[PDB]
Design a protein around this ligand. Structure first.
Ligand SMILES: CCOC(=O)[C@H]1CCCN(S(C)(=O)=O)C1
Lengths: 237, 300
């Protein structure tokens, strides 16, 4: 069924599952033509497919070339997402295929279900949560690999860096979402927070700074403050 | 013209013959119906005065034998029977016609409603959907389930309608996932028309039978099938021109004959607002659209 606050801990059990986010697959820059009309120019996107338990990210790069000569691109982007997710599943060994797949946008239910007709024992589910995975392109290393790609490309990451050595999945996921939520509401400030102190660095094989546990609490606090405020700044309270 | 006589009418019932109906009182002198037009399927159906639960009915064809209705007090329904004895039959029916104990199938001559509702419906196919082969007539009621429903429980009492499922492998060609799901032409034309039904007339016939079983018996699985088969054509970009024209006439009369107080349960909003206003064939159903707007604009 649908996924919400109540059944929140199912994500971290031992049934393999993946979240699929498609916000950043079809990305445009709307401009003005010489004649004074408006055209879009596409830039590279990604499917953000993520295992909320292990933190493995299947970052599928969508190269602009995939839209050449196609109509109803916003609609095709959902079928192209479904097609790439189904191929990822097919490439995985059986013992690694998910038992569930949770789409973050309900428009993806039918495209995936149709592409997954061969996988009847995999449940496709929507969610009631307003998750911030759109903000994934505010993570520099992720934005960088997408903008630089010259052909279609899959790139594997772990979005938790090494966190799981010291914290539980549940907790890792709550840090991820708290980080993305801040990056979505006020990117500049969120980033200022993460990189104020030049002494804390981002290991080359990681995505986020190497904070100690105490630093993470300070950092997590500062993000919550930001998220609260921009809600005031936005709603005047 | 042929006759469906009755051994008696022991309980109070409302009897239907095709779109016509009349009230019979408990133990009223009543030996059946006469003047039934030859050349069409018919259905004769029943709703008891006491228990409005369970509408039930028999599809039949007067060319396929002599069929009469005696009440069964053990099973509690009017049953359709079939004698062999032609001579016993002709002369007993004649007796009642003489004492004028039969009502007249009351067809107005300008009216082609029944023909229109049953154009493509043939007893041969009905008997394949309602499997029961020791009888030339077919029993249906309110609560019978379809082959597809029991997929999602008693198969003998099933309606073995053709299974349609838009999110299925049968419907969706590997490699054309998006194409086949937004344009079902492949499914309609190759899988169903060329493959399963062979021609549009067997298709249209199942369509027309489903709708009639929905209307007369309020069979929910039938209404699902009627709606599915409409939806498959309207969601097909490529349909022969003659099917599109016939389908408009077909639906027109089904919407015409529907009771006006039944539209809330037997008509599916999504299917119709799609077929009429969003699908490929939104422009191709002029008469069906015209009447639905003049009679049921609330739904739309
Ligand atoms: C007085 C009760 O009448 C009947 O029972 C007859 C009318 C139905 C027709 N038959 S038949 C043709 O002989 O099977 C019986």
């Amino acid at each position: 069924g649908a996924m919400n606050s109540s059944n929140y801990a199912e994500l971290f059990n031992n049934d393999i599952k993946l979240f699929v986010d498609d916000t950043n697959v079809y990305r445009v820059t709307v401009h003005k033509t010489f004649e004074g009309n408006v055209a879009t120019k596409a830039i590279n996107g990604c499917i953000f497919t993520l295992n909320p338990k292990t933190g493995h990210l299947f970052l599928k790069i969508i190269h602009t070339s995939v839209w050449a000569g196609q109509k109803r691109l916003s609609q095709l982007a959902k079928w192209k997402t479904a097609e790439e997710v189904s191929a990822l599943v097919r490439s995985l060994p059986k013992e690694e295929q998910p038992k569930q797949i949770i789409v973050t946008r309900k428009a993806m239910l039918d495209p995936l279900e149709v592409h997954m007709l061969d996988f009847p024992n995999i449940a496709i589910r929507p969610t009631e949560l307003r998750l911030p995975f759109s903000a994934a392109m505010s993570i520099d290393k992720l934005s960088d690999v997408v903008m630089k790609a010259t052909e279609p490309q899959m790139v594997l990451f772990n979005i938790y860096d090494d966190w799981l050595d010291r914290i539980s999945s549940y907790t890792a996921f709550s840090r991820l979402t708290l980080l993305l939520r801040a990056l979505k509401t006020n990117e500049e400030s969120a980033k200022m927070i993460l990189l104020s102190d030049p002494t804390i660095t981002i290991k080359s094989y990681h995505l986020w700074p190497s904070f100690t546990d105490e630093q993470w609490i300070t950092i997590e606090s500062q993000m919550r403050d930001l998220i609260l405020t921009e809600y005031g700044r936005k709603y005047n309270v | 013209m042929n006759t469906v006589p009755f051994t008696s009418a022991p309980i109070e019932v409302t009897i239907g013959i095709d779109q016509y109906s009349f009230n019979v009182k408990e133990n009223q002198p009543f030996h059946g119906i006469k003047d039934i037009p030859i050349g069409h399927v018919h259905v004769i159906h029943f709703q008891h005065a006491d228990n409005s639960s369970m509408r039930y009915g028999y599809w039949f064809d007067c060319r396929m034998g002599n069929f009469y209705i005696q009440y069964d007090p053990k099973d509690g329904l009017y049953k359709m029977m079939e004698e062999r004895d032609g001579a016993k039959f002709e002369n007993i029916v004649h007796n009642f016609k003489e004492r004028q104990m039969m009502v007249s199938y009351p067809k107005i001559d300008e009216d082609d409603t029944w023909y229109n509702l049953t154009e493509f419906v043939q007893m041969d196919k009905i008997r394949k959907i309602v499997r029961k082969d020791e009888n030339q007539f077919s029993y249906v009621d309110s609560s019978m389930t379809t082959v597809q429903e029991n997929e999602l429980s008693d198969p003998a009492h099933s309606l073995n309608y053709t299974v349609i499922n838009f999110k299925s492998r049968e419907a969706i060609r590997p490699g054309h996932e998006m194409e086949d799901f937004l344009d079902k032409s492949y499914y309609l034309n190759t899988v169903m028309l060329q493959g399963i039904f062979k021609n549009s007339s067997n298709y249209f016939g199942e369509l027309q039978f489903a709708f009639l079983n929905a209307m007369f018996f309020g069979n929910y699985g039938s209404s699902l099938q009627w709606h599915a088969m409409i939806e498959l054509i309207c969601s097909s970009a490529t349909v022969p021109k003659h099917m599109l024209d016939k389908l408009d006439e077909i639906l027109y009369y089904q919407i015409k004959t529907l009771p006006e107080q039944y539209s809330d349960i037997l008509l599916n909003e999504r299917v119709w607002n799609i077929c009429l206003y969003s699908s490929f064939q939104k422009n191709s159903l002029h008469n069906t659209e015209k009447i639905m707007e003049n009679k049921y604009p609330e739904l739309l």
